[PDB]
Amino acid sequence: HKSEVAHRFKDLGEENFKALVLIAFAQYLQQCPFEDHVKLVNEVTEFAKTCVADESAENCDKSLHTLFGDKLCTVATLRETYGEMADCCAKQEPERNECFLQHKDDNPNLPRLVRPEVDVMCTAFHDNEETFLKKYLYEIARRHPYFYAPELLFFAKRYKAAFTECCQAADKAACLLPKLDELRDEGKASSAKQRLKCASLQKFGERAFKAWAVARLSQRFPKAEFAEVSKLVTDLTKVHTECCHGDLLECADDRADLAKYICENQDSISSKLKECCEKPLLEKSHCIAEVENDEMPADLPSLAADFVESKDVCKNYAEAKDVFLGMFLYEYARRHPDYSVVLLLRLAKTYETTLEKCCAAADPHECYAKVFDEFKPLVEEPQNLIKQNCELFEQLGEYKFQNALLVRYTKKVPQVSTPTLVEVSRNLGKVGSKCCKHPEAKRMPCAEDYLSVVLNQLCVLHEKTPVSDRVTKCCTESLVNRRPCFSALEVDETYVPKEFNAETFTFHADICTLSEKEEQIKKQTALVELVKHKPKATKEQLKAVMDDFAAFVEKCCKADDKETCFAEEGKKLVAASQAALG
Ligand SMILES: CN(C)c1cccc2c(S(=O)(=O)N[C@@H](CCC(=O)O)C(=O)O)cccc12
Ligand SMILES: CN(C)c1cccc2c(S(=O)(=O)N[C@@H](CCC(=O)O)C(=O)O)cccc12
Ligand SMILES: CCCCCCCCCCCCCC(=O)O
Ligand SMILES: CCCCCCCCCCCCCC(=O)O
Ligand SMILES: CCCCCCCCCCCCCC(=O)O
Ligand SMILES: CCCCCCCCCCCCCC(=O)O
């Protein structure tokens, strides 16, 4: 009301409040030490209570932006530590706030955060639970200035649970380790998706984004009217735009609003929202944004009615092209929760091309009457890839399936560095085990989501070290053409084999003491190196060496004087294998 701080405090609660203030400050003063921030939090929090007691007390009427800005400029070593950023304090709001966003280094030069030993972590945890988690919250926040604060807080709590459960466990490590890994990946995923979306909104512009939204929102809320979906798409676009700009507050307020709105009108939006709309302010958004797709209406007409048969297609279309196409998407999206958003985009795109040609011809209806037929091969491509791939994965295991992928892509883009090929293939495989476990009706949406980050990661670390033009075409192609572009890659006939290296195929017994994740990655690296040396090798040939090798390993890791073995058979293997592969 008359005091923003007081208000947020009352809403959030002391705990959440102090956690967010901490995260907020860690995202700007990325260089200040943890103790420094904690003091700021306390000073701000104390101030907050002052205003809760008397909404009219000093400065309590100031805006969060101003309050935050002033506290920020309070840091003495500001100009010494951040230099140019200190010049932000001369400017008045909102230039001051704006000035800060511009100096929020999206990727500082901080040391990789190392994972301590389970025991040391559990003891730290148990001894001083609060500072143990805050301290790490701080470490993550400063390294990820754009990670939406509240989501970060959401993660912290999942971590807390893991430590509370696991540190009591018999085998602490067997309980904790796996959870920490599932949280990391999930965190990397949220990070990549966020930057991805913002990146998209940047290059491709609003339209394409709204297009994406209509499709996603329709699949999720098939019972809502198109007018409700357009309303939501509009607000969601403002939200992502603002949130991408990096301003936490503005971003948060838009998010709360849209959640409030959706809840009040939840009856005309989705039935699956009850649960989500009860939750606390800080958790509404998160919940809603992930809510399962609602059951789609049973009495739903054939699309062909309003989009192929009708004699007013072009009329309705010229009247408002995008609204029409949007309606197409809305209609097609909600009848297919099983389609990937991007696949729906391809149809809509295809439909649009057709209408553009057809509506400027003798008689439209004749020209576009069989367009749905143009869809068939489009829908099928992603489906046959999924079946063909999940099948292979069912036979072979995650690991063996990854090797298949390894051989397949190395042949496609031999120029790519071996360590890059190994990672991509591994991640690709994970997507394989994570999605194939799903009923065929949810597979495609699943692949889209995991595959989207993986391909982006692939593109980013190639943007940097350009190795192939073909990978660059795919990486800079339409966001809806990206995946098919890669699927279209064919064996590289131009590639010239890599001169043989003895050092690259010699193994030591240390391959026995190494952990699974390490043995595999050590074997897989040799595999990519093998293919990069003899690309003309048939699956049979390769399957031979791999079999020979596999034994070699086990065999040499189950006999005395290991080192002797690996060097003795080593000569033999390399020798025999080289001849088999001409
Ligand atoms: C849940 N989420 C906030 C996260 C938790 C733990 C680690 C996270 C990381 S991370 O550990 O820094 N992940 C590193 C790679 C792995 C490493 O070097 O340790 C990174 O890509 O930046 C990134 C993004 C989100 C994370
Ligand atoms: C709570 N509300 C304000 C929302 C915030 C952010 C995303 C939202 C979405 S969404 O973008 O379609 N849901 C996203 C996941 C959430 C995210 O990445 O932010 C998706 O399926 O790709 C739907 C409804 C409400 C949303
Ligand atoms: C997300 C905020 C909660 C902070 C608690 C993190 C505790 C785990 C410490 C290890 C993190 C390093 C990343 C990793 O390798 O797992
Ligand atoms: C609410 C109306 C906004 C939706 C506009 C419909 C756009 C459909 C065209 C699909 C093109 C995808 C963009 C792209 O080429 O990347
Ligand atoms: C001066 C410090 C300001 C403290 C930061 C308060 C902003 C956090 C509000 C969180 C609201 C939840 C929004 C959402 O649902 O995403
Ligand atoms: C021309 C020298 C070729 C000999 C080197 C063979 C090494 C290839 C990697 C084998 C890994 C197979 C995967 C596995 O069985 O786990």
Residue numbers in the entry: 3 to 584
According to the publication:
With a typical circulating concentration of around 0.6 mM, HSA is the most abundant protein in blood plasma and serves as an important transporter molecule. The monomeric 67 kDa protein has three structurally homologous α-helical domains (I-III), each subdivided into sub-domains A and B. HSA can also bind drug compounds with similar physiochemical properties to its natural ligands and may significantly impact the kinetics of their distribution and elimination. Later crystallographic analysis of complexes of HSA with specific compounds confirmed that drug sites 1 and 2, as they came to be called, are located in sub-domains IIA and IIIA, respectively.
HSA–myristate complexes were crystallised in space-group C2 (with one molecule per asymmetric unit); DanN, DanE and DanR were added by soaking these crystals in solutions containing 5 mM of the fluorescent compound (see Section 2). The structures of the HSA–myristate–DanE and HSA–myristate–DanR ternary complexes reveal exactly the same pattern of ligand binding as was observed for DanN: sites FA1–6 are occupied by lipid and molecules of the dansylated amino acid are found in sub-domain IIA (drug site 1) and in contact with myristate in sub-domain IB. The dansyl groups of DanE and DanR bind in the same positions as observed for DanN in both of these sites and make the same specific hydrogen bonding interactions with the protein. It seems clear that this moiety provides important anchoring interactions with the protein. Although the Glu side-chain of DanE interacts with Lys-199 (as observed for Asn side-chain of DanN), the Arg side-chain of DanR adopts a more extended conformation, allowing the guanidinium group to make a salt-bridge—albeit a long one (3.5 Å)—with the side-chain of Glu-153. Since the mode of binding of DanN was found to be essentially unaffected by fatty acid binding to HSA and DanE makes essentially the same set of interactions with the drug binding pocket, it seems likely that bound conformation of DanE would be unchanged in defatted HSA. Our results reveal that such compounds bind preferentially to drug site 1 since this pocket can accommodate the dansyl moiety in its central hydrophobic compartment in an orientation that allows the pocket to make specific hydrogen-bond interactions to the SO2 and amide groups of the sulphonamide moiety and to the common carboxylate group of the amino acid. Moreover, these anchoring interactions allow the polar amino acids groups of the ligand to be positioned within a hydrophilic sub-chamber that is both large enough to accommodate the variably-sized side-chains and contains counter-charges that favour their binding.
